[PDB]
Each structure stands twice: as C-alpha cells, then as structure tokens.
Structure 1
Amino acid sequence: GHGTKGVVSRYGVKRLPRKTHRGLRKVACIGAWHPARVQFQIPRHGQKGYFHRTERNKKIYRIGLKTDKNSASTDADITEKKITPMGGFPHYGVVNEDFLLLKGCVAGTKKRPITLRKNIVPQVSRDALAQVSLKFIDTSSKIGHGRFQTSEEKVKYYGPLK
C-alpha cells in the first residue's frame, strides 16, 4: 500500500513541460467534445498499491526445515547457518519455523500472509524440470550494510573489546 496517488505515480505518464502554468504533474488531457463524457480509459488519480495480484510460475529453489541445524548452510560452506540473517531480518527477526526459498520478487510487504498455489496446468519447461544446486546462501545483515556474516566471525575479526 502507498495511499491515493497522482497520475504520474499511479500510471506512469510523462510529465508536462517545465513551462506549465498549473504544474508538471497535472493530468493527461481527457479530450473529445463528442462523446460528451470522460473516457474511462484515461489514467487518473486514486489508490496506488493494495491490489490483488497473482504472480505465476515462480521456482522453488529450496525448502528449508526447522529441524535442520544446518538449514541455510551448504556443502560448499559448512559453517552453521539458519536462514535468519546476522541480527535477524529487518522487521521480522528470527525465522521461527520451516521455510520456502523462492526465486525473485513476491507481491506485498514483509509480515504479510502469502498464498502459494500449484500451477493451473503442470509445467514441462526446462526451468520447471531443472534441479537447483545452490552453492551459497547469504546471511549478512540487512539492518546495516551487511559487512559481516555471523556472530562467531564478528568475534574472531575484532578480538579484544571492553
């Protein structure tokens, strides 16, 4: 959700020239004397975000398990990692239980419920068929600029402190 927004934000129209008397973000010209009504297809001010959306065909890269002590660890990097970042996720902290690692972007905010559904028809594509082999999963901080990866590593790096 972003609130009720202007035409540029909501619909992506080009701004009016620098010259414009009543502002650059002033609307698209509706036009038509006949028909004698606004054409609904015109872009216009109102809500941005909070829309229902189906993302389709997102690949599962990994299903994590709470039971696994090495859940976000890999065969390549064997140090103890669970999916929870260094200092936890911003606004979410510890991931409590089992988890889905899904390719790319997902609609809505963190903290939101998300519904996963099987595809309407089975998928025979290369990308569908393919077996993922992960090499590494980051657990660096996203609270900061993620300069470090684990609490042990931070202790080893600094050493002495007050």
Structure 2
Amino acid sequence: MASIHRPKRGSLAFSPRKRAKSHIPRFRAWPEATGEPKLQSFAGYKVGMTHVIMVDDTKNSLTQGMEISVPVTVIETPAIRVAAIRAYAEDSTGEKAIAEVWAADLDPELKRRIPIPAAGNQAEALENIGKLIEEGRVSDVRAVIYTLPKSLTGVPKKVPDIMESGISARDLGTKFEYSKTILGTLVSVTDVFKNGTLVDTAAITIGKGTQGPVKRWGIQLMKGKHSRQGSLRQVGTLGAFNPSRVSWRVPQMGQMGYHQRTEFNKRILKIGSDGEEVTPEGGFINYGLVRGDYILIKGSVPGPSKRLIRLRDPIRAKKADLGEPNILYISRESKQG
C-alpha cells in the first residue's frame, strides 16, 4: 500500500500528561558555579504583559541599531528570606540529607504553612555541620527560602511558599561560609541577577481541564463527506488487529494543562523598584496595580497571572555577555479596550 508519511502527532517526551503534584515548580538540575558565592535561584509572581521600544543591540542581528517593539512580561519580586541550611552526603545511592539548621528569627505568618520551629541549637548545630565538612563527609550545601506574599495586593494568599535553592561557589568551605553569612536575612532580586542577563523560568501552565484528542494532541478532524457521518472530532483508529491492544502512544482524551514546563534563554531587560512605571491606566485586568519592585522579562512566560515563577541562571546558554538594554518607551496604555 502506497502510504503517505506524516510526522507523529504531539510529543511523547512529556508523558504521562497528568496534573502536577504541587503548585510550586521544582528544579531537577542546578548549574555549575563559575564565580563568587551567591544563590542560584529566585521566586516571584506573574502579573501581565506589556511592550517596550528598545534600541536593538543583538550582535549580528539584521535589525541592529534601529528601534524595535518587544513583548515583555512583568514579574513582581518581593524580597525573600533565607530560613535554613541543609547539608547533603554522597554515597553509592546518591545524595542524602544529613543535617539542617534553621534561623532564629522568622515571620509569624509562616505558621500557616508549618508550625514555627523553636530556637534551640543555632551555634552548636552550625559547628556540627562545620565538623562534618571538616571530616570530609558533606559534599554540597543548599539553602531553604520562602516568599512573603503579604506585601502584594493582587495575590489573595497570605501563606508563604517554601522551596530549596543552590549556592554557587568553587569549594564546599566557601559555600558553608557564605551560607553562614547570609543565614536568616532578606535577599533582594538585584543580589541574584544582573540586568541584561539570561535566565530560565519554570511554572505550572494554565489548566484547561479534560480535553479531547483534537485539542490535546492536535490531530486532524474528519474531512469532506466524513464530516457529517457521526464522528468528527474522534480519533480514526485505536490500533491494528494485532497486537490486540491499544498502545499508550495513541492519542486519547484526558487532563490538559496545569503541568510543569521550563523555558530557556529569556533575557532580563530591566530591574525596577517603583511600580508606577509599569502600571497602566485602570491597572492590570483581574490583578490590580504593582506596589513593590518588579522585573521585565523578554518574551512570554509559562503560567497565568498570579502564578509563582521560579528563576535560575541559565543552564544551556550559548551567547557571551550581552549588556544593558536601552529602554526608550514602556507602554502604559489601558489593557482594556
């Protein structure tokens, strides 16, 4: 039979397609440290989109030296608190948590997520970790941070979000010293990312609920005379005669949306401090207006408004150091009508 070849419908690199087990994106891989100690991640909340007019400066690009319009996503980033230090041990069966020390001072609203740890061992526990590193058992150190969404207004929740980050250094002793220095303090977004650099974004995407094969995998409808015979948006065949089973690679209906996704090489265009420079007339739709400091990201970002966005320094970047963008105009038109 003279068959006409067609690429497979949809991608099997994301299966099974089920609801994310949490509302907070989790990072599986941390980059390699190539500089002084610092955190490798940050968190914020998505607001909406605008566009800016910036003098093009991408090297070797066609549109170099002339004005362009770019879509940007505005992200609110109130300062985070470093609440704990965690130590990991390496063996045959991979890393294993072996110690944690919490900060003495914490926010009273953290009681909504977990009961507040009490100030027991602080100096003795830290020196315990130091002795462990001194006897060459500890391999790496990670920091535990949370957000403080009570300062914002467009986000209804008042309970913090807890997650683990990574410190970037060239030695375990340096990581431990830096973690001791920064433990139990507030870290601003400027201390993590420099303006003009690239980042990686993770977030839970918008949920569409249960969807059929056509909208879930993008299969073809029924064409022509077949479009009015009873099956229009159903799949053609569920399999062959043999094997006598339906393969897992056949398109079917189920959950669509609310998965975890990652975007690569998004550029940071502006680190702001005052919210009046991005707020349109009438505020953003369904959000309100910006009150704290923010950040502008070139392009789009996964997830809807009022969703938590995690950021980490690039893991597969190609291009060399880019530079500070030259923003000329930031659109503050009404998003409404």
TM-score normalised by the chain length of structure 2:
0.36
State, as a whole percentage, how many aligned pairs show the same letter.
Answer: 42
User: What residue in structure 1 maps to residue 256 of structure 2?
Assistant: 48
Q: 2:245 aligns with which of 28, 37, 60?
A: 37
Task: Give 2:328's match in structure 1, choosing from 135, 138, 145.
Answer: 135
Poorly superposed stretches of 4+, deviation over 6 Å: none
How is 1:4-19 mapped onto 2 (pairs within 5 angstroms)?
Answer: 4-19=210-225
Quick one: distance in 1 between partners of 2:314 and 2:258?
A: 24
How far apart are 1:142 and its partner, in Å? 0.6
Query: Please, which runs of 5 or more residues in structure 1 have no aligned partner?
Result: 72-80, 145-162
Q: Offset of 1:31 from its aligned partner?
A: 2.0
Determine which structure has the larger strand proportion and give its number: 2
Q: Which residue of 2 aligns with 1:3?
A: 209
CA distance in 2, matches of 1:28, 1:56: 36
Deviations 1:110-151 (A, max 9, x none): 011111111125x4515x52431111110100122xxxxxxx
In the comparison of the two structures, how many residue pairs are matched? 129
**SS of residue paired to 1:8:** helix
Q: Does 1:125 align with 2:316?
A: no
The residue aligned with 1:95 is 290
Separation (CA, whole Å) in 2 of partners of 1:23 and 1:16: 7
**Aligned-CA RMSD value:** 1.7
Higher relative contact order (CA 8 A, sep 6+): 2
Displacement of 1:87 in angstroms is 0.8
2:299 counterpart (81, 104, 126)? 104
Aligned residues of 2:239 and 2:245 also touching (Cα < 8 A) = no
Q: What's the CA shift for 1:42?
A: 0.9
Q: 2:123 — aligned with what?
A: none
What is the SS of the residue equivalent to 2:328?
coil
Per-residue Cα deviation, 1:24-55 (whole angstroms, up to 9, x for no partner):
10113122211111111111111121111011
| Mapping 1:140-159, distance limit 5 Å | 140-144=333-337
Q: Secondary structure at the match of 2:260?
A: coil
For 1:24, the equivalent position in structure 2 comes to 232
Unaligned 5+ segments in structure 2 are: 1-206
Q: Which of residues 255, 280, 286 in structure 2 aligns to 1:85? A: 280
The SS at the match of 1:111 is coil
Deviations 1:42-69 (A, max 9, x none): 1111112111101111000111113xxx
**Counterpart secondary structure, 2:264:** coil
Aligned-residue offset at 1:4: 0.3
SS at match of 1:10: helix
